[PDB]
Paper text:
While reducing NAD(P)+ to NAD(P)H, MEs catalyze the oxidative decarboxylation of the TCA cycle intermediate L-malate to produce the TCA carbon source pyruvate and a byproduct carbon dioxide (CO2) in the presence of divalent metal ions such as a magnesium (Mg2+) ion.
To find the acetyl-CoA binding site of EcMaeB, we collected cryo-EM data of EcMaeBholo in the presence of acetyl-CoA (EcMaeBacetyl-CoA) and determined its structure at 2.03 Å resolution. This structure reveals that EcMaeBacetyl-CoA forms the V state as does EcMaeBholo. At the acetyl-CoA binding site of EcMaeB, the thioacetyl group of acetyl-CoA is inserted into the space created by the α4 and α5 helices and the loop region (V499–R506). R475 forms a hydrogen bond with one of the carbonyl O atoms of the pantothenic acid moiety in acetyl-CoA. The methyl group of the acetyl tail in acetyl-CoA shows a CH-π interaction with Y510. The α4 helix shifts to approach acetyl-CoA by 1.5 Å and the α5 helix moves away from acetyl-CoA by 1.4 Å.
Numbering used by the authors:
A (entry chain A), B (entry chain A): 2 to 759
C (entry chain A): 507 to 557
The structure:
């Protein structure tokens, strides 16, 4: 716990406190715009809203924000710690809101511990938000707040902690009945636990068609029957059962077709599973520890379908399936609330998507797709790119038929086109790489073993279990620096040290290097010096001999001093005559790759075509459809310099060698990234949307552009420089490489080594 | 009004509604970070705040936001129109907050029309904000709200609409007494008007040292004396005077040393000024129309000092002097409120800055500096870059001595260094250009007169009075397109049309062109064709003949087809042998210029040195200190390609020819923009901070980098491409030029033509 | 070691040698060590090149 505690504490404490910030979306540097954006001109918009209140959407940005409001009464599993102490959780919830759907979130921690004032303040804050996600609140005051607001608010009010997880649970049950081959009106549902995210689920399931008399509710006290306490509170009498001696979970665990558990860990015992019914449908939503372990249920009864809230098992009940996309559906039409119709229109799109998987470009073999509608796959993945095109139009149509939509949409196809254009610019492709690497770690040698960044990265890799590292350097220096940095990695146990000043394999290593380079200017004495003073050579020989599977080098020195060694020892991949390096950037238009940043100073047309094909294949392996643009200062033949002609010839060669690849050129960068400019210049261009692969005419342009964009349009680091064309898994980094970049590159190298490391 | 109404309505209605947006400041695309940013890891930060509540500043971003809260009871001069209808004004106020100081603003329009619930909701919203700027609220409920909050809030509460303008008024009076040579305890102050931004000013002036019995208050009723109404409300009895027959403004206008007017236009008459005292000190803060016209006061009495709230006169009382910087001072220390000490510590820094002007790099002769402490200059300019270094440390020191500061600062010099680093990246240099151009418009010919963008720009230029335009094209097409676009410009009155198909000056024009180009491959017949089919040639001959002062061309066609004409007709400036083009970008590090984007395909070392010197001089004329970086894929001699050696030679030449210029190289782009990387590589580099001029080795790198940065790191448009080295004021644009870019370039050309157009 | 590699870096900082590269050179390149020794006056001459 201490290591994880320190990692989380330092996750955002040192560089900048917090996890979100407020940023403007429009520019302001001039005069005569203040005369219009302020008092002299701002009077005209105001008088329009006064005459037409409905015109507040054209001249303002009112309806796009959501409030995440808490009081800190039940902070995760920590309980009542206060509203202020719960700010990090609310901030992280807003982060998840923004990262998965693109929802602006204001996180508020009201200090009120009384309900009445809670509704007072939330109703006062009405004009600020288009929807209020109540979070970290006890019961049953939340229901009262939501009902009073919805009957007093002309704007959407949606407690997500109830209704969103209700939707996710309901969709996992409607599709589960298909697999178990049972009817909704004949199944028996048993629930052990009452709380905030249980009553909404029960209401949704009852409105789905399930009989109320077939539902049994419980808590820590036992079966919630009639005649248990003199003062038995509400939200428990509408679902209570008559007293027939039933008092515990096991009394109703027999014959239960569905078991929706949302309270308490370690509740279901092996005997209860043994005495359960056939084809169990267990929904153990408990996050810190589920009600029943999915490995434990599938052992005693292999016919059980388990839909947990954890990230370690499939069919994950994560609210990131609910609060991003359900709120996005509610907002995009401008509702007045999510009634049962919208709650069902959203629950049916999720279920339809879960049983209509059709591949459509995935991360090659990187990871584990296994997308087949069955027991192990009942709901869409937490960050499915398609869950904005299926939910938002569905909710908009439901609102149009329900009378709560204020501004109807006429042409839906344009709407889906706009939403898919929006979702094309988000792709978290490093998670499957990390998962695949964790599935089977490989041996990776790091020649710069004395570097502080490399030691930090080695600690992280050992903690995550991504690879088995081998460090080259002086043992005394490495141990002293590990102690100075306060790391927990130990030589020999966590990682292996190769002493470059002394090793029993010195003779074999330098003899092999001499045999490689004897007719390339290297004498035996020079080989002996190289196997002592050049760790890259040691690592390359190690890889070639099969004592390691991959190598990450280049954090010290110049790129070509490592690349020359790599090329000499490994050589090119079969059928390849050139190599290139690709760097990745996250721009507003999406993930963007820049090709040949480090290898070739001035490639010719054939080299450019080979680089383009390799880059397209590599990007395809990430799960991204390649869209290539050949860049030049000439815009579609406007210049006749030899560089532009070379780009045109490379385009012809690429078209000859790969007719299925999306590519155009030669063109300017803005035309490559902005579709409107390109459509103005070349209406019938084969390149659609924004290009994600930019191939440059020469080294200097590529490197200068990449450096300026990296320091200017900085939105995180994924991979780079990615080396292509070499016959072994190896990448050369740069001295400015960060710890996260090193870890990512090691994971990518492990994944490459797993599949025939050639 | 209709034209301004349409301009303001379309200012932000068509492209995107609204004027602000919410943007994150940290990246999120990976896994294993959700395990730390959320539930599994987010528990560790929460338990730390529970044990230590003061630790909420290290693990959260709590204290940086301000609420701008209104109820729409007095919207500017429109009165009571509602809270929702006042959203554009609040949004614009937040825009001004962010643009001048960098303050995050949440704009709220509460529908409550009752005070008690207003304090209820604002006190409920305490944990969201570090300060509440009450706006658009009547009196005296605001005082009650502020007092109750400050006595119930442990966080800063600062009604800016009272106290900030009180500070600005007080600073304009303390410095005014120096000019008028009078004592604060012996002056007579007369006020005609009671309102929100008058009682705070009176309180501040009384605490400054002025006697209460020397202050006279008035309203529409008249003198606020005792015994006027049976129920005379508060905030008027603490300053009322005894009844001696004084009932109107003129009864107390005699002998008044200071006249602070903040209510009503057209209040002071000529006779009142005639019967006033010597050295009048008039503060007419009325925004829509001042109490007395500054031109009217200075005529009857030339000894009067007037400090108005308008932008048409000096000594402007604009809250952009108050709410950005005073709130910044309050926030940067983490106060508990702005008491009199902070209110005075901020008012003394403003006064000290107003009478301690020392130039320190201004916009050359572009505009009107005239910074001399006198009657016409009593307060710092509304967007003075230095008003964050003088106010924030002053307020922090005042808080440290007052016991309201929670986290004291030890080393102040580091603090001022950080603040000046922050303020170095903001410079609104186009406003002085626009002002200087408006002072003396010039004749500017636009060869592409039939373009829709050019017609829109011509309409804007005529409206702003920046230049006298001359359009070249077919009159029928121009009139038909003007009618189709619905513009109000009329040929012959607003602008002059030159018909390229018929003009009585055809023979002289083509004869002059032939005389220029007879030994450069142009026959007489070719000259006759050129003076019909090439509008750029017509415009260039017009400029050379003195029938126009400048030309803006290039919105259609290729850059070099216009540049060749310009070079042939005009030639180089005396003492210059090469030309270059500079493009401007607004990056996170500040205004950034990229040199030689369009002229020279591959300049040599001497050409690069000349380009660098011209770019440095041009940037200096904008009011920006030039800091040049020579860019290459080689980092301080790491490569030996001819391009890197050329950059090194150019560096040596530049150092020889300009020893006073800040410059270094050759280096990578990231080292040029990020000081930490450069300090790591070259500790003793002469380049300090972030470079704002990037000189590129060849055309392709410059253009590709500029295009990618413009479409990716887009933060508005200022100028570009700026042509340097030509012997006449002319600029060649590109086909992708926007209307705003054309207007800006025309203004720059006018300013260049005003000063010896060579 | 520190004085030697610092002097070498001061000589070669604008010739493609970083501080880390200078530190590596003052360990793996005896010719550089001898040349710095001679330039510092701790030796009068150097004979190198047998390898
Ligand atoms: C994975 C890697 O390889 S990382 C790189 C590791 N780097 C190193 O190990 C470098 C350190 N080692 C070295 O530099 C060399 O092994 C040396 C110079 C010390 C010795 O190698 P060489 O002198 O060229 O020859 P050789 O391989 O025969 O070894 C000589 C050794 O045998 C000993 N020896 C002496 N006479 C004899 C003999 N007749 N027969 C065998 N050994 C003998 C020597 O004393 C010497 O001992 P030592 O090296 O343990 O001190
Ligand atoms: C600012 C600018 O200049 S924008 C560019 C404007 N462009 C133009 O004006 C192009 C339109 N004009 C033209 O192309 C030419 O003036 C032309 C071709 C029409 C005529 O010019 P030319 O034939 O070369 O010769 P010249 O200058 O002597 O003019 C001939 C005219 O004189 C007339 N003329 C005939 N005999 C004689 C004579 N003995 N003496 C004088 N004029 C005569 C012709 O009928 C003709 O009349 P018109 O041009 O009004 O119809
Ligand atoms: N979608 C999700 O991921 C999700 C959503 C909600 C909850 N959860 C998880 O579910 C658990 C409880 O959440 P909650 O909203 O129900 O909070 P809660 O109501 O505060 O706590 C669970 C409640 O269930 C009862 N309970 C406790 N232990 C029990 C046990 N062993 N057997 C039966 N009943 C027991 C108690 O009710 P009484 O005190 O009234 O007897 C207790 O108050 C937590 O682990 C939480 O993380 C997950
Ligand atoms: N810093 C600034 O730029 C700034 C700040 C504040 C105000 N102003 C300007 O000052 C004016 C008034 O603002 P305010 O806050 O005072 O609003 P206000 O109180 O709502 O309106 C002005 C008040 O002054 C009185 N008044 C009106 N006309 C008058 C006249 N001709 N002579 C004397 N008194 C008159 C009336 O008070 P009774 O109805 O009680 O008699 C009236 O209610 C507006 O033009 C406003 O824009 C500028
Ligand atoms: Mg929660
Ligand atoms: Mg105001």
């Amino acid at each position: 716990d201490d290591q994880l505690k320190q990692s989380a504490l330092d996750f955002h404490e040192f560089p900048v406190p917090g996890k979100i910030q407020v940023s403007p979306t429009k520019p302001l540097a001039t005069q005569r715009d203040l005369a219009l954006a302020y008092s002299p001109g701002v009077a005209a918009p105001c008088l329009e809203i006064e005459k037409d209140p409905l015109k507040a959407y054209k001249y303002t940005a009112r309806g796009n924000l959501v409030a995440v409001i808490s009081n800190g009464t039940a902070v995760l599993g920590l309980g009542n710690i206060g509203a202020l102490a719960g700010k990090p959780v609310m901030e992280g919830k807003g982060v998840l809101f923004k990262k998965f759907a693109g929802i602006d979130v204001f996180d508020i921690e009201v200090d009120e511990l009384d309900p009445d004032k809670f509704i007072e303040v939330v109703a006062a804050l009405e004009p600020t938000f288009g929807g209020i996600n109540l979070e970290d609140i006890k019961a049953p005051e939340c229901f009262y707040i939501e009902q009073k607001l919805r009957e007093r608010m002309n704007i959407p009010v949606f407690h997500d902690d109830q209704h969103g997880t209700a939707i996710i649970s309901t969709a996992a049950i409607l599709n589960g009945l298909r697999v178990v081959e049972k009817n909704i009106s004949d199944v028996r549902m048993v629930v052990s636990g009452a709380g905030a995210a249980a009553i909404a689920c029960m209401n949704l399931l009852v409105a789905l068609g399930l009989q109320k008399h077939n539902i049994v509710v419980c808590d820590s006290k036992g079966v919630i029957y009639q005649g248990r306490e003199p003062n038995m509170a509400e939200t428990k009498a509408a679902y209570a059962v008559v007293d027939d001696g039933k008092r515990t979970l096991d009394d109703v665990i027999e014959g239960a077709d569905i078991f929706l558990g949302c309270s308490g860990p370690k509740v279901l015992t092996q005997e209860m599973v043994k005495k359960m019914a056939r084809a169990p449908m267990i929904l153990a939503l408990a996050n810190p520890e589920p009600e029943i372990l999915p490995p434990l249920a599938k052992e005693v009864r292999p016919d059980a379908i388990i839909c947990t809230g954890r990230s370690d098992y499939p069919n994950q009940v994560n609210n990131v399936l609910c609060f991003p996309f359900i709120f996005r559906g509610a907002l995009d039409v401008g509702a007045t609330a999510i009634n049962e119709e919208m709650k069902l229109a959203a629950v049916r799109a999720i279920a339809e998507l879960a049983h209509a998987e059709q591949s459509e470009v995935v991360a090659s073999a990187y990871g584990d797709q296994d997308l087949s509608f069955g027991p192990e796959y009942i709901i869409p993945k937490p960050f499915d790119p398609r869950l904005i095109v299926k939910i938002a139009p569905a909710v908009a149509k439901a609102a149009m038929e329900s009378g709560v939509a204020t501004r109807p949409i006429a042409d839906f196809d344009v709407y889906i086109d706009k939403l898919t254009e929006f979702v094309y610019k988000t792709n978290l492709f490093m998670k499957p790489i990390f998962s695949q690497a964790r599935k089977a770690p490989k041996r990776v040698v790091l020649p710069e073993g004395e570097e502080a960044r490399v030691l930090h990265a080695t600690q992280e890799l050992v903690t995550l279990g991504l690879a088995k590292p081998i460090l080259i350097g002086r043992p005394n220096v490495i141990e002293m620096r590990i102690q100075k940095l306060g790391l927990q990695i130990k030589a020999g146990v966590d990682f292996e040290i190769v002493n470059n000043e002394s090793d029993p394999r010195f003779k074999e290593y330098w003899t092999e290097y001499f045999q490689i380079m004897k007719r390339r200017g290297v004498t035996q004495e020079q080989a002996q010096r190289a196997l002592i003073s050049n760790p890259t050579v040691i690592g390359a020989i190690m890889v070639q001999r099969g004592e390691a599977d991959a190598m990450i080098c280049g954090t010290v020195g110049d790129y070509h001093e490592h690349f020359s060694v790599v090329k000499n020892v490994f050589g090119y991949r079969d059928g390849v005559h050139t190599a290139g390096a690709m760097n990745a950037l996250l721009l507003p238009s999406g993930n963007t790759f820049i090709a040949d940043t480090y290898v070739n100073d001035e490639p010719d047309a054939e080299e450019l075509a080979e680089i383009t094909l390799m880059a397209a294949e590599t990007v395809r392996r990430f799960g991204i459809e390649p869209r290539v643009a050949l860049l030049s200062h000439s815009n579609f033949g406007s210049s006749d310099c030899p560089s532009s002609s070379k780009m045109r010839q490379a385009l012809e060669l690429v078209r000859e060698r790969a007719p299925e690849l999306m590519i155009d050129g030669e063109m300017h960068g803005d035309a490559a990234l902005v579709e409107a400019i390109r459509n103005d210049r070349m209406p019938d261009s084969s390149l659609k949307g924004s290009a994600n692969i930019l191939v440059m005419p020469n080294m200097e342009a590529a490197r200068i552009s990449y450096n300026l964009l990296r320091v200017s349009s900085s939105e995180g680091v994924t991979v780079g420089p990615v080396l292509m064309g070499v016959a072994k898994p190896v990448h050369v980094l740069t001295p400015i490489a960060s710890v996260r970049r090193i870890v990512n590159m090691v994971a990518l190298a492990v994944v490459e080594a797993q599949t025939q490391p050639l």
